[PDB]
Amino acid sequence: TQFQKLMENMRNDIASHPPVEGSYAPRRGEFCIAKFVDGEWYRARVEKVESPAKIHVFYIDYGNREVLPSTRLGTLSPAFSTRVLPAQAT
């Protein structure tokens, strides 16, 4: 699937240009990458900023949510944006 292909490409790119701590600042409505409980990165969207340790995100390709620290968020590179592949949730 296009989703599986984007995830392979994105995760290879992230492993090659690992997010730098503090570089990405979450803002409501922005797309980003989020590191899920499995240790893997996923495309996400920031929904609410409660605290630096508590950012509410939506995993745009999988349809679920998580509250996680800023440290587990990074910049979504334009190569893997929703301009390239729309959100795949459902």
Next chain:
Amino acid sequence: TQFQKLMENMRNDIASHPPVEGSYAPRRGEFCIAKFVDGEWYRARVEKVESPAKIHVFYIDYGNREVLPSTRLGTLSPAFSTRVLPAQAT
């Protein structure tokens, strides 16, 4: 039955404080509540995290497994934990 009484009390409590999307994050070996195909909540344990939409759980009072999204999982309140009544799988 002890099981019947705990389920009633647990479900009444869940209804008073429904799980909030994103609040509970699944991790292997943790207990949680899981919403089965009958629309009812059951005690469960996380066995494997495949993706945000695919969490492998074991229904600890019934002995079956299901793969379900994070949205259908919630925190198991201490009042209904295995410290209160052990896993009842037959």
